[PDB]
Amino acid sequence: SVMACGVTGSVSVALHPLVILNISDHWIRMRSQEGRPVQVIGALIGKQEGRNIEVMNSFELLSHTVEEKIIIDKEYYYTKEEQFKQVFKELEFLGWYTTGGPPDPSDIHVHKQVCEIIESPLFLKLNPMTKHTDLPVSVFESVIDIINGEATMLFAELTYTLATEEAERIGVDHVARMTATGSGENSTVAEHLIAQHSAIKMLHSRVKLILEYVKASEAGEVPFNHEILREAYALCHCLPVLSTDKFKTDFYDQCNDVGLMAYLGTITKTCNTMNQFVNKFNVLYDRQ
């Protein structure tokens, strides 16, 4: 077993969408080049402030399989290290990433070589063949444990977060707006209401968890979890919200405005269809 049991995260890891973007692109191209989903290996860079680690960017590494062992071209990694120096100074190496499922007895070999380079590398593994609705990205750290009298390096899962800036947020929001359309338009409202469906599902799952906790407290658990059940009941008392004449008036105002806009759009489509029909009819029987 390469996974440590009972070991909690010692540092906080912040991940950016660009890192996941690099991993996905690396896996796709290698799959396209060599058929099956060939495992990819790259490196992680970013800023580290004490125990707070922020992974802002990531890049690829050259590796070779010799004696059924993955040998990372650290010389290429070092050649690429000064290459990224020429563009960015504030970004420092933080760890390496790969693709696959559970850790295999080859990633430990990769990690020990990366641990040789720097003081403390971070290990990230992405699962491109996942089927659940959760993020198939996990961050692991290096821990030394005495197993059967021998010091064996293990991986401890880290409770990383997803940190992003206003820029990236707006950018990917409009990337989703652009995916809402396309050359091969299958459906648009389908994707829209599927997105709302996923959001409502997340909220419903939260409500189910709260209700289950309340029922358990009624049965066992803590009879009163203090501020938690207090705030839960208060929020359930704010569920009605209560609108005023002005809010309903403004809601109906916006609805009427955009409905009039929709009516105008339907009129435009209908008049275009009428123009096409008239153009065809003027050729069907009419002259001049």
Cβ proximity of 42 and 28 under 8 Å: no
Number of residues that bind other proteins (CB under 8 A): 83
Q: How far is the CB of 144 from other proteins (least distance, A)?
A: 31
127-186 residues near other proteins, rule: CB under 8 A: 135, 162, 164-180, 182-183
Q: Which of residues 49-68 bind other proteins (CB under 8 A)?
A: 60-62
255 binds other proteins (CB under 8 A): yes
Angle, helix 107-117 to helix 74-85, in steps of 10 degrees: 50
Helix (H) or strand (E) holding 31: helix 17-33
- The tokens describing 80, both together, are 């690429």
Nearer to other proteins, 202 or 209 (CB): 202
Residues 93-132 that bind other proteins (CB under 8 A): none
In whole angstroms, how close is the CB of 67 to other proteins at the nearest point?
22
Which range touches other proteins (CB under 8 A), out of 76-84, 101-109, 114-122, 152-160? 76-84
Sign of CA dihedral 250, 252, 255, 257: negative
Choice from 3, 29, 52, 252 touching other proteins (CB under 8 A):
29
16 phi, psi to nearest 5 deg: -115, 155
Question: First and final CA of the chain: distance in angstroms?
Answer: 86
Which amino acid appears at position 267 of this protein?
A: I
Residue 70: exposed, middle, or buried by beta-carbon count in 10 A (0-12, 13-18, 19+)? middle
* Sole window of 1-9, 93-101, 146-154, 198-206 interacting with other proteins (rule: CB under 8 A): 198-206
What is the gyration radius of the CA atoms in the chain, in angstroms? Answer: 28
Query: Both tokens of residue 253?
Result: 């105002």
CB of 7 to other proteins, least distance (A): 26
- Cβ 163 vs Cβ 54: under 8 Å: yes
Binding residue for other proteins (CB under 8 A) from 250, 268, 277, 281?
Answer: 268
Q: Does 17 bind other proteins (CB under 8 A)?
A: yes
> What is the nearest approach in angstroms of other proteins to the Cβ of residue 98?
14
Q: Is 45 in the site for other proteins (CB under 8 A)?
A: no
